[PDB]
Amino acid sequence: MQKRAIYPGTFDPITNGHIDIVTRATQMFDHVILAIAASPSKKPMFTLEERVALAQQATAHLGNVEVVGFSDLMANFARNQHATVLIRGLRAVADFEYEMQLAHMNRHLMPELESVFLMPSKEWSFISSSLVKEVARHQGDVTHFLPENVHQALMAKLAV
Amino acid sequence: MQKRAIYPGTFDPITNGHIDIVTRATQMFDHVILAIAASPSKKPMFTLEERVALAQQATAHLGNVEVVGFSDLMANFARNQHATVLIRGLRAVADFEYEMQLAHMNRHLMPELESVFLMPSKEWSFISSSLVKEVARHQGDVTHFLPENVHQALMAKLAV
Amino acid sequence: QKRAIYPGTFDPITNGHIDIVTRATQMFDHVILAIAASPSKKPMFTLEERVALAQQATAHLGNVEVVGFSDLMANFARNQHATVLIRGLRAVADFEYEMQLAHMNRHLMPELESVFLMPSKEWSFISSSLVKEVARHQGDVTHFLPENVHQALMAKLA
Amino acid sequence: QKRAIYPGTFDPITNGHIDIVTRATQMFDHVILAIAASPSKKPMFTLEERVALAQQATAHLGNVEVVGFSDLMANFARNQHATVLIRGLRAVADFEYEMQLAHMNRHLMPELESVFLMPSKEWSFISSSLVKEVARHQGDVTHFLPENVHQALMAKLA
Amino acid sequence: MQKRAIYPGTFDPITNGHIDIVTRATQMFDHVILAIAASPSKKPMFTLEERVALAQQATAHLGNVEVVGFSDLMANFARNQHATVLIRGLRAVADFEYEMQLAHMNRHLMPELESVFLMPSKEWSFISSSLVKEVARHQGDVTHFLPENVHQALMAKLAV
Amino acid sequence: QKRAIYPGTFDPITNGHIDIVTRATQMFDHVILAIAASPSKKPMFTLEERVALAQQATAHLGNVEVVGFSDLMANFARNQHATVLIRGLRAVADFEYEMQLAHMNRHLMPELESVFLMPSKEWSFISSSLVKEVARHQGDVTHFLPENVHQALMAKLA
Ligand SMILES: COc1ccc2[nH]cc(CCNC(=O)C(C)(C)C)c2c1
Ligand SMILES: COc1ccc2[nH]cc(CCNC(=O)C(C)(C)C)c2c1
Ligand SMILES: COc1ccc2[nH]cc(CCNC(=O)C(C)(C)C)c2c1
Ligand SMILES: COc1ccc2[nH]cc(CCNC(=O)C(C)(C)C)c2c1
Ligand SMILES: COc1ccc2[nH]cc(CCNC(=O)C(C)(C)C)c2c1
Ligand SMILES: COc1ccc2[nH]cc(CCNC(=O)C(C)(C)C)c2c1
């Protein structure tokens, strides 16, 4: 079986937790699409072009990762990408509840897209893009949670 | 005992999950007030008049349902409506936590108003007005989650 | 005439159970407090002791009927012509199991509606199990139990 | 050739387990449904009964292999050359224990990736334990089990 | 050991739940800094000066409490205050999840600052500043949840 | 002089317990690591074995006192003149039970303040129960336990 999997999200910015999940996905599936949502409702810190470029560079060492931006409903994009596997990272209980609702909805929308939940390292089990940004905004050290290129862009973003 | 129960919420829009809960409430209590909150803080998709009209039409087949709009504190409205039963739908754990806080607060405000928790069908256990709207905004099919009249109004709303 | 059933092991009946059954009696015309034989749990008190303790602790509530049962819930509720099943809400861990039971009970008897009532903040952190555990270590449990239940628990542990 | 393992007690195998293993077979080339001896749990069905029931209930799935094991998970998975470990997602209480198992299994065998699959809403509130409990009270469990499993459960309880 | 503990938060406004937690902290630690975050992102009902004055007056009877405002990352402030104990109140499961994420982040930022979780009275286990304000805005009685001075300021705030 | 008590079964004491007690010693002047007789749980190690293992595993911490007790928590804490009760935070399921215990303990002894400490991410997914389970299947548990505890666990399972 030559499986195409999709790993969607805002990735604003991509963290070491996302790198962990996408690395596990590439060791399991032949082709992994890391799909970055335009997500204008969330009003992201980084533009879609910035998020795509940051994720491309942070996953460049992974030969079977394709970084792409998308604005549709995830399931509409996934169907057009011929993906049958939907990657989700489960860190804790709060994730679980919302992720079950999304997975049942996604299954209603596209039954041929199977949601799979991967578990990150204990190291990234307590972080989110939101928390990292918040700590960074308040002059806290977030170097440990981010790829080098992402850390450099976050510093540059917060300086201006 | 000739019980008057109140089922409050934003109902923006009323879903099949809300119809399920209010149908269970009508089989248990003599009179059920489906109370629609003005809720301007949430900035609803549908005006109060639209939400009331949609809920009226979606519950018309239930003879002991009264659809009414309200702007007060729920408990202030419930006291003026001579309701002693407060209907809440419990879908999952996240609901549970917030619902317990609301129920203890509502009990402090009006001890004679008893909070009762009803459980929806497995079918509606993973949906919310918020998720349905989000999927609809992103060009996803939500026909299965809504009464026909609500589906028609949601399509019309998103077209303009 | 609306008939509700409040099932459980009630090993022993606590102030938390009295709170839930009192709320149920203010809402429904007749409330059956149904005590499960529950031999799998290996209860401290026999079904007869549990029934007698609950009868005496609810005697002041005119619309409560205390009955013992070994039946499947759905069957006993149908046989009792009840259409409402009362459960108390405590913790998330209780809630999850309660949803599984409620969906099972609904499959078995769709006309039996599960209703969840919320106890006083006072009883929101107690269980029959925790009260027994405190009492096994000679701790003061007078506050959590009806007087007759407290007396029987002391007598049992002596 | 991607080899996945779906471990558990399967005492007995339910429609929820059939749902999870069917999803696993549509994703992975070979799926080993691994039945734990689990003597600590004191199962209703022996390992041999559990294996025979699961074999027959999954016979229609060409890429499922039913095997019994008493080994440490990580060891049996290495010995079976599997790199994927399938778990089903039910409740938060299941999820928490599943995270502990998955982190332990990762410590023991880092190349064994735990994957969580979500069952149909239909089986989201059932467990082998709850089905057995319903059956112990003579309740209708035909809907939750494969026919062969239903027949063996009735025979066992008779 | 002459321990300095910090109890951070928005305290918008300080409630009986916060008074309960800070009272427990003062019975355990020599000096307790009740640290009020400027928190402009949350857009607080009360200004920082109002929140500090309200908390000062509501804790005046506690001799080892110091009420101070701060705008830094909490951990940056805590380090400059020579605090080695970080007080958090745990009411319910939802608190727990977010509090674990914050505590691991705070530990990364300042390992010498130990997070300690205190449990409030059952009486305050179902309230928050947010819920109290919401009930007050909707003409509900919140007298029981607040110190007298806070209740007076909340009434005055909502009248204008 | 601030005296804290860290109670539990400690069957056996793990690196997670060592982490919690080490954090407690950095915060409080004297820490009593209190080992419950806990016969209801039917422990793998006797109270004497559990005390000896914990004594040796905490010997490097000068302000730790390891003591066995069969008393009610509130009584032993009063008798030990402690005003702080240390608990570790793991999972939501642990947290819920911990709140019930803490409210009960507060009813019994209001001057005994329950404090929750958070372990390292390293020990956030382990328990004495899970470590024993891994060891029962001959799995490598050297990483989760003090050396003396690992040796006693191997000897016990042999
Ligand atoms: C598991 O599916 C995800 C996860 C994170 C996501 N962030 C953005 C999207 C795409 C737009 N939104 C959607 O498609 C829903 C279903 C309305 C949420 C997205 C999808
Ligand atoms: C169970 O009581 C509800 C549930 C959903 C609700 N949505 C809006 C309201 C009315 C206004 N708000 C209130 O009355 C609170 C108590 C401040 C929330 C409402 C009430
Ligand atoms: C909410 O329903 C309850 C709660 C507590 C209960 N204790 C005993 C029973 C009856 C026997 N058991 C059953 O009928 C099930 C559904 C198989 C568990 C019972 C039912
Ligand atoms: C997700 O891993 C599972 C799930 C269910 C299981 N039932 C039996 C096993 C194998 C023996 N147990 C182990 O190897 C542990 C890790 C010590 C528990 C098993 C593994
Ligand atoms: C347990 O630490 C808290 C708790 C509540 C808090 N409210 C505001 C702050 C200060 C600014 N924010 C931060 O320092 C984080 C770490 C980015 C949240 C604060 C800190
Ligand atoms: C947080 O308090 C604990 C935790 C673990 C414990 N293991 C044993 C005890 C003492 C005996 N038990 C009690 O005193 C209760 C309160 C009745 C359970 C103990 C206490």
Rounded Cα distance, A10 and A68, in Å: 12
Q: What distance in Å separates the CA atoms of residue D82 and residue D74, rounded to the nearest whole number?
A: 10
Q: CA–CA separation, D121 vs D131, rounded Å?
A: 16
Q: Which tokens sit at C104?
A: 């099972």
What would the two tokens of residue C105 be?
A: 């009970």
Q: Which chain E residue's Cα is nearest to C92?
A: E93
SS3 content of chain F, % helix, strand, coil (to 5): 50, 20, 30
Backbone angles phi, psi at D25, to 5 degrees: -70, -25
- Give the 3-state DSSP-derived string for chain E, with helices as H, strands as E and coil as C: CCCEEEEEECCCCCCHHHHHHHHHHHHHCCEEEEEEECCHHHCCCCCHHHHHHHHHHHHCCCCCEEEEEECCCHHHHHHHCCCCEEEEECCCHHHHHHHHHHHHHHHHHCCCCEEEEECCCHHHCCCCHHHHHHHHHCCCCCHHHCCHHHHHHHHHHHHC
DSSP B93-159: HHHHHHHHHHHHHHHHH-TTSEEEEE---GGGTT--HHHHHHHHHTT---GGGS-HHHHHHHHHHHH
DSSP A42: G
Residue F65 CA to ligand 6 center (angstroms) comes to 18
In Å, the largest CA–CA distance within chain E is: 48
Which is nearest to E118 in space by CA: E4, E15, E28, E38? E28
**C-alpha distances in angstroms, F143 versus F56, F122, F134, F150?**
17, 10, 12, 9
Residue corresponding to tokens 């209860």: C43
Number of Cβ within a 10 Å radius of residue D128: 24
What would the two tokens of residue F22 be?
């080490």
Q: Residue D124: CB partners within 8 Å, gap ≥ 6?
A: B122, B125, D16, D90
Strands (E), C47-142: 64-69, 84-88, 113-117
DSSP single-letter state for residue A12 = T
Give the amino acid at C126.
I
- Quickly list DSSP for D72-138: -HHHHHHHTT--EEEEE---HHHHHHHHHHHHHHHHH-TTSEEEEE---GGGTT--HHHHHHHHHTT
User: How are beta strands C3-8 and E65-70 bridged, if at all?
Assistant: unpaired
- Residue E63: other Cβ atoms inside 10 A: 8
Under DSSP, the state recorded for A64 is: T
Grouping H, G, I as helix, E, B as strand and the rest as coil, residue D11 is: coil
Q: Is F1 exposed, middle or buried (0-12, 13-18, 19+ CB in 10 A)?
A: exposed
Site of tokens 């954090």 = F23
Distance CA B134, CA A86 (A): 19
- Best CA proximity match to A59, nearest among A16, A93, A94: A16
What's the rounded Cα separation, in Å, for the pair A102 and A117? 12
Other beta carbons within 10 angstroms of residue C148's beta carbon come to 17
CB D27, CB A114: distance < 8 Å: yes
∠ at Cα C51 (C50, C53), nearest 5°?
65
From chain F, which residues contact A within 8 Å (Cβ)?
92, 121-122, 124-125
Q: Under 8 Å CB-to-CB from C49, ≥6 apart: which residues?
A: C152
- Are A81 and A33 in contact by the 8 Å Cβ rule? The answer is yes
Phi/psi at A38 (5° precision): -55, -40
Please report, to the nearest 10 degrees, the dihedral formed by the alpha carbons of residues A86, A92, A97, A100 taken in order. 20
- CA separation for the pair B81, B140 (Å, rounded): 39
Cα three-residue angle B16-B17-B19, rounded to 5 degrees: 60
Element (H, E) at A134: helix A129-137
Using a 6 Å cutoff on CB, does residue C72 contact ligand 3? Answer: yes
Contact C132, F66 (CB under 8 A): no
CB contact at 8 A, A11 and A42 = no
Q: Which amino acid is at D147?
A: E
Q: How remote is the CA of residue E22 from the centroid of ligand 2, in Å?
A: 30
Closest ligand 5 atom to residue E103 Cα is 1
Say how far apart CA C14 and CA C122 lie, in whole Å.
12
How far apart, in whole angstroms, are the C-alpha atoms of residue C2 and residue C86?
13
Task: Identify whether the C-beta of residue D111 lies closer than 8 Å to the C-beta of residue D39.
Answer: no
Residue C15: closest CA among C148, C152, C158 = C148
**Chain C neighbours, 3+ Cβ pairs < 8 A:** B, D, E, F
The Cβ of residue C30 has, within 10 Å, a number of other Cβ atoms equal to 19
Structure tokens that stand for E55 in this block: 């908390």
Long-range (24+ apart) CB contacts under 8 A made by C65-68 are C65/C30, C65/C31, C65/C32, C65/C33, C66/C33, C66/C35, C67/C32, C67/C33, C67/C34, C67/C35, C68/C34, C68/C35, C68/C37
- The crossing angle, in degrees rounded to 10, of helices C147-157 and C47-58 is 150
What 3-state DSSP class applies to D30? Answer: strand
How many C-beta neighbours within 10 Å does residue A40 have?
9
User: Under an 8 A CB cutoff, do A93 and D95 touch?
Assistant: yes
- Give the A:D interface size as CB pairs under 8 Å: 58
E interface residues, F as partner, C-beta within 8 Å: 1, 3, 24, 27-28, 84-85, 90, 93, 96-97, 100, 103-104, 107, 114-119, 122
CA quadruple A74, A78, A81, A85: dihedral sign: positive
For residue E93, how many C-alpha atoms fall within 13 Å in the half-sphere facing its CB? Answer: 27
- Cα–Cα distance for residue pair D27/A2, rounded to 1 Å: 10
Q: Which CATH superfamily is domain C1-158 in?
A: HUPs (3.40.50.620)
Kindly list the residues from chain F whose CB atom is less than 8 angstroms away from the CB atom of residue A125.
Answer: 121, 124
Q: Which of B125, C47, A132, D98 is nearest to E101 (CA)?
A: A132
- Let me know: does F9 contact F43? Beta carbons within 8 Å: yes
> Whole-angstrom Cα distance, residue B106 to residue E142?
11
From CA B78, how far away is CA B86, in angstroms rounded? 8
Do the Cβ atoms of A118 and D99 come closer than 8 Å?
no
Work out whether strand B31-37 and strand B4-9 pair parallel, antiparallel, or are unpaired.
Answer: parallel
Nearest CA to D116 out of A117, A103, A96 is that of A117
Length of chain D in terms of residues written:
158
Residues 6+ apart with CB under 8 A from C95: B90, B93, B96, C89
The number of C-alpha atoms within 13 Å of B1 and in the hemisphere containing its C-beta is 20
- Beta carbons within 8 Å of D122's beta carbon, 6+ residues apart: B122, D15, D19
DSSP assignment of A68-108, as one string?
A: EEE-S-HHHHHHHTT--EEEEE--SHHHHHHHHHHHHHHHH
Enclosing H/E stretch for C36:
strand C30-36
Backbone phi, psi, residue D4, to 5°: -115, 150
Method: X-ray
Give the tokens for residue F71: 């008393």
Alpha helices in D5-91 (DSSP H): 15-27, 47-58, 73-79
Looking at residue C22, the DSSP 8-state letter turns out to be: H
**Cβ partners under 8 Å of residue E134, min gap 6:** none
The CATH architecture that domain E1-160 belongs to is: 3-Layer(aba) Sandwich (3.40)
User: Is-cis flag, bond preceding F12, omega within 30?
Assistant: yes
Please give the distance, rounded to the nearest whole angstrom, from the Cα atom of residue B57 to the centre of ligand 2: 23
Residue with tokens 């992975």: D28
3-state secondary structure of F115: strand
F114 forms bridges with which residues in the sheet?
Answer: F85
Q: Which amino acid is at B36?
A: I
**D74 vs F139: CB contact, 8 Å cut-off?**
yes
Check: CB of residue C27 under 8 Å from CB of residue C60. no
Query: Is the Cβ–Cβ distance between C99 and C127 less than 8 Å?
Result: no
Q: What is the C-alpha to C-alpha distance for residues F103 and E119, in angstroms, rounded to an integer?
A: 9
How far, in Å, CA of F107 to CA of C49, rounded? 28
**Residue E52 to residues E26, E36, E66, E158, F39, Cα–Cα distance (Å):** 18, 7, 10, 19, 52
CA F126 – CA F138 distance, rounded (Å): 17
- Exposure b/e, B73-100, CB count within 10 A at least 16 = b: bbbbbbbebebbbbbbbbbbbbbbbebb
SS3 C63: coil
The closest of E121, E21, F109, A94 to C124, measured between CA atoms, is: E121
Query: What is the DSSP pairing of strand D30-36 with strand D3-8?
Result: parallel
Contact D75 F125 (CB under 8 A): no
- E127: nearest Cα among E5, E31, E18: E18
Q: How far apart are CA C76 and CA C85, in angstroms?
A: 11
Query: For residue E100, what are the CA distances in angstroms to A2, B51, B130, E72, E116?
Result: 40, 40, 27, 21, 11
Q: Tell me how long chain B is.
A: 160
Q: Are C31 and C63 in contact (CB under 8 A)?
A: yes
Residues linked to residue F64 through DSSP beta bridges, in sequence order: F31
Q: Per the annotation, does B19 bind a ligand?
A: no
Checking DSSP bridges between strand D84-88 and strand D113-117, what pairing results, if any?
A: parallel
Of residues D90, D74, D71, D76, the one with CA closest to residue D14: D90
Which residue numbers of D belong to the known binding site? 6-10, 17, 41, 73, 87-90, 98, 123-129
Reduced to 3 states (helix: H, G, I; strand: E, B; else coil), residue C86 is strand
CA dihedral D86, D87, D89, D94 (to 10 degrees): -160
Distance CA B94, CA A76 (A): 28
Answer whether D108 contacts ligand 4 (Cβ < 6 A): no
Distance (Å, whole) CA B119 – CA B28: 13
Do C35 and C65 touch, CB atoms closer than 8 A?
A: no
CA distance D65 to C131: 48
Instruction: Give whole-number Cα distances, A82 to C104, D35, E117, in Å.
Output: 38, 34, 48
